[PDB]
Design a protein around this ligand. Structure first.
Ligand SMILES: NC(=O)C1=CN([C@@H]2O[C@H](COP(=O)(O)OP(=O)(O)OC[C@H]3O[C@@H](n4cnc5c(N)ncnc54)[C@H](O)[C@@H]3O)[C@@H](O)[C@H]2O)C=CC1
Ligand SMILES: NC(=O)C1=CN([C@@H]2O[C@H](COP(=O)(O)OP(=O)(O)OC[C@H]3O[C@@H](n4cnc5c(N)ncnc54)[C@H](O)[C@@H]3O)[C@@H](O)[C@H]2O)C=CC1
Ligand SMILES: NC(=O)C1=CN([C@@H]2O[C@H](COP(=O)(O)OP(=O)(O)OC[C@H]3O[C@@H](n4cnc5c(N)ncnc54)[C@H](O)[C@@H]3O)[C@@H](O)[C@H]2O)C=CC1
Ligand SMILES: NC(=O)C1=CN([C@@H]2O[C@H](COP(=O)(O)OP(=O)(O)OC[C@H]3O[C@@H](n4cnc5c(N)ncnc54)[C@H](O)[C@@H]3O)[C@@H](O)[C@H]2O)C=CC1
Ligand SMILES: [Cl-]
Ligand SMILES: [Cl-]
Ligand SMILES: [Cl-]
Ligand SMILES: [Cl-]
Ligand SMILES: [Cl-]
Ligand SMILES: [Cl-]
Ligand SMILES: [Cl-]
Ligand SMILES: [Cl-]
Lengths: 333, 333, 333, 333
């Protein structure tokens, strides 16, 4: 009569998951931002866990769990989990990779166009009371807005979202390059894209750089004081991937010195983001959104339902064989 | 030794046009907002005129010119000129129809995505100090953001910009309908679009309505208290065409009552626009830009050079035969 | 109790049209190839006429009709009718312009690919008993097959079919140019195409030329001994438009001398076509189809139903106001 | 002063490879169709081997080599090599996966259109002397030609060529489904395609089935007497992948009984192909090409140069680390 315990770590709403797990697991929530806020009962008895991106699990955090057997990220990115240590400790880790692909690609294109077209900045100027009566004043307030056709969009990471961005970018006349050192040769041919071998080549030829790679152990601060200097003078930077990929120190100085004309960021090294704190406090030509590229009403539901099914498959079946999106089978023993 | 006089009515900068007209016409500027601000010398002696969109010419205004023989709009729209009366008075009217086509289509897609993705509103909330730490808070602050695929984009006016928008919209998964009662049947087939016969059908099936038609004598307040009721509950409205097409009274009430979830406007019934005056003073979910959809550094130059060449062709050749983009040959006698 | 007479000139099957015209007109057929084969009753009493492309009507032919008031081409092209003389004689002429647009564009792409890929010629070689065992033999039998990406496709006439071809050609990596001296500037921008001003420029830069213009009084033998010399050495020629546009004499010599590597023709100066007669008797690298680019089971029905409705509208309403696709309103008096 | 020996097994021309291997290896050719035709010197001393698709290497064949250390397929498919046994024997196997991707996709679209549009069959009828004078005769000779828009194209194997086909098929109005049980979920979203879970679903919903998967140990005769019955009545079949995927027995009967309206085959169970032998001797509505989907003058050179470089990398460096496209690293010991 005793069911396994499943805990929603960094959240409180479990409404979507309940119908799928009702007869399978007892569902509790922690609404926690760190391991220090998880009730002892959870650490001891929790067999499964659901979590988003607002809490990190190190080996130290993972070792506090005594019965945990699966973690499911409600989302694609799993950089916030020590995946290797989870496998060493016998904990399967899964993600939801497909739900918000096109939502994120559309958010990225929105930011790209918001830089080339300055719509968001033009709206601000009107909210601030700027009066734009003459054509000379239109040119002035819209200074920086550039023609898109002929421009080169450089994609770092041509996975699910990267490919979706590439196909959308082609519709506007962008010349699309991409850098992805983990794919085999020939993917550029199917999608009619141009490929480059190094990060330096990508930054050197791109008028607008957009990040679409996972954050792994080999690309933290991929955009740093060194690689920022490899970018075109007056280029754009867009990041809907992970904030850990950009050295905000180097980015702030680049915006201030005009080496980078503008930047649009949905993610940041330290989240939540605030224009009153951080290395970007006074950075100009900066657009930001609070890690919302993924969100739609349908997507939010679809990924929670998928994550709930993965939990069910783990409790009901054999780990890791019954799992559809386990991302650490190699490390699991 | 006496050259014809050409006047830039509603502007002052003539730098781009001078190299093309130096040996052909004397160039002066008026920097005028109305006919009342034009120097008497211009009204009497001006043979040609260059003007943007910030000044209107009625028959009353046109009759004040005693030597004018051609007007060239530096831009595509010529609704601000009494075209028929200009032809009656023997004045050719020309425009520049091709320069800013893709700039405007990209601005339109930016506004479309800014509504579906709420990037501009999410940026404001961060500037306003909103703190978005939990996923529940992300869902809250981004409430209204919707998935694009499957949504129906309704285009009113499938000309140069409309077709450019249609092709871009298809890349995001939009289902594209269009209404244009002046085209012959078969244009929908070449571009693979669906066509509807009436404005009511367009508004009835569209989740997002975008205007791309010229303002003529048969579509002022095309979007009015009556036709607004024919739109889907919670639909979007985008207008980069002409402000005279929308009854801002009806639009304000629709936004306030939630019948329309959001609106993005680059043009307005009375320009320049201000959030502190007009029927849209307190309208919610409203994005606005100061008639800047056309602008790029290249476009601004290209259209001024084309307009200068048209002037030259008129002074040097025979009106209207030597004109490339005369829009009132039928009325000219 | 007496109904008007409507005659299907160059056909016999009236099954599709009968349900639409039953209570409106008496329907007869002539199954005629020339005016000389039309029964006297038809010439005297026929008020309306339906015809395809296999019969020509000169002023001499038109003058033989004493009551005819409308002609409806079951199809888009109306070059086979003296349109001006028909208007002088008070005869409205209409067409069906939209039905087979995409069928024809798909046929054109089939011919284009059949030249670049030599599928049809490779099939023939297998039917002829050629044995292709080694790679060296594959290269030999497929000699001439070329990579498409980077190649330039030159479109002459960017109307309904031309635009449909252009959009399909872009999917294969073609660089698309077009020549159309009757369109206004700016259509190239909406569809992202490159435009040229003269026929010579089109032929000079194109690796594959495809015709998509109507046959009018200013382009008979548009491809002639002179303009053929303006084409690239080893270029392709495709014609799904009208045979009168090509001088088959010049074309045969070009194929024989290798100036043109191959040609695909759905239409010919004299139809029906036969490989045993005509200037193309012994021309090599020649593909031909019997004027079938338009045909699909749905298209054949759709255009006959549309043509029947046009007839009905003419008999029931006022000519030319009630007509949807009258192509000679200017000449009608 | 003694260099390693490299042999071109099933070919004779080594001109392209010589400049790359001149100072690295002695190059000989065998022009062999089977292992029985290879000179004893080659079997004993050959360190590297180059081969196309016209010779098969079993474990029995592989065991005859006493010094062979790498095989390089000049092409993508390596089904003609016992890959596992090659690894057991310490032989690295490599391929050239990217060269002819778009050539093959264009050949596939040519065959697809040749079925829907019957261009190749219409050309034959003209070569055979068929006279097509009336529209009724055009409909007759072109019977079977169908409208493409709305039709469903089912892709089996969405790799390099499959994705290239999918993007081209979308330009014609196809609804594209694909079946590929080896990809992870989410690839359909990036390319905007619909995905199905089983082969039966693919065949059940597809009007035209096109094969684009490698031939492996789990899909020989994937199209068989059983799965052919799961296809739509009157559907099309296209195969530019491998002939071993189709049971030509079942295919012949399907074409004869009309269950399949037509088939286009670039590959066959037994190659070379002949219309006078095999289960397809008398099959109707059959188009065939002699395994030429890959060929272009540029592609033929590019893959031979890549294959030569792979050989060089193997002789010069460390196997398998220095290899770019080794397809049997797992089996190599
Ligand atoms: N709201 C948001 O901000 C959202 C963010 N994301 C993030 O976007 C990123 C991409 O997601 P997906 O495309 O679904 O992942 P994916 O796994 O489909 O694609 C990742 C690609 O990046 C490439 N890559 C990895 N390291 C690289 C490097 N150093 N340089 C170049 N390429 C590299 C990989 O080869 C792979 O192809 C993820 O980090 C994910 O967390 C995803 C959805 C929403
Ligand atoms: N910065 C800005 O806000 C810019 C605004 N525009 C405006 O956008 C509009 C479109 O420009 P283009 O596409 O270049 O013009 P266009 O002449 O190429 O296309 C206009 C189309 O609208 C159609 N139309 C007219 N009245 C209509 C009605 N009542 N209902 C439906 N369709 C109707 C016409 O048939 C025509 O096809 C113009 O009014 C122009 O002034 C253009 C460029 C920049
Ligand atoms: N089975 C077949 O072979 C079929 C043939 N056709 C033919 O294809 C042709 C095109 O049809 P649509 O695109 O529907 O006609 P359309 O009227 O939509 O387009 C014709 C275009 O050709 C252009 N043009 C005319 N003369 C020209 C010249 N000398 N140089 C360059 N451009 C020129 C016009 O400006 C116009 O834009 C027609 O002649 C039609 O008869 C159409 C359908 C089926
Ligand atoms: N001249 C010719 O006929 C040419 C033939 N080919 C052939 O085309 C085929 C595809 O080549 P690429 O796309 O480059 O290979 P690829 O490795 O890029 O793609 C193969 C795809 O097929 C899928 N697949 C394998 N077995 C399957 C099954 N039973 N059901 C559904 N999907 C399955 C795999 O998951 C993979 O995604 C190969 O067999 C190759 O030999 C390639 C080039 C020229
Ligand atoms: Cl995320
Ligand atoms: Cl480059
Ligand atoms: Cl404007
Ligand atoms: Cl509908
Ligand atoms: Cl026709
Ligand atoms: Cl050029
Ligand atoms: Cl192959
Ligand atoms: Cl389905």
């Amino acid at each position: 009569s005793h069911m396994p315990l499943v805990a929603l770590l960094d959240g409180r709403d479990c409404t979507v998951e309940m119908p799928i797990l009702k007869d399978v697991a007892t569902v509790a929530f922690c609404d926690a931002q760190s391991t220090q806020e998880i009730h002892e009962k959870v650490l001891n008895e929790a067999v499964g866990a659901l979590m988003y991106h607002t809490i990190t699990l190190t080996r130290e955090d993972l070792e506090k769990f005594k019965a945990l057997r699966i973690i499911v990220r409600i989302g694609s990115g799993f950089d916030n989990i020590d995946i290797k240590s989870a496998g060493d400790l016998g904990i399967a880790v899964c993600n939801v990779p497909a739900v918000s692909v096109e939502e994120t690609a559309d958010s990225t294109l929105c930011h790209i166009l918001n830089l080339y077209r300055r719509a968001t900045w033009l709206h601000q100027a009107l909210r601030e009371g700027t009066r734009v009566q003459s054509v000379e004043q239109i040119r002035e307030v819209a200074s920086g807005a550039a023609r898109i056709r002929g421009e080169t969009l450089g994609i770092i990471g041509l996975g699910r979202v990267g490919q979706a961005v590439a196909l959308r970018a082609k519709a506007f006349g962008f010349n699309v390059l991409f850098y992805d050192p983990y794919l085999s040769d020939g993917v550029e041919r199917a999608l009619g894209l141009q490929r480059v071998s190094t990060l330096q080549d990508l930054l050197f030829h791109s008028d607008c750089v957009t990040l679409h790679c996972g954050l792994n152990e080999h690309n933290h601060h991929l955009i740093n004081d060194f690689t920022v200097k490899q970018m075109r003078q007056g280029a754009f930077l867009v990041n809907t991937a992970r904030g850990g990929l950009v050295d905000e120190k180097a980015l702030a100085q680049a915006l201030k010195e005009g080496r980078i004309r503008g930047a649009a960021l949905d993610v940041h090294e330290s989240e939540p983001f605030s224009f009153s704190q951080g290395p970007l406090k006074d950075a100009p030509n900066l657009i930001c959104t609070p890690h919302a590229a993924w969100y739609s009403e349908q997507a939010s539901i679809e990924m929670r339902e998928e994550a709930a099914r993965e939990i069910r498959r783990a409790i009901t079946g054999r780990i890791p064989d019954s799992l559809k999106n386990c991302v650490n089978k190699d490390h699991l023993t």
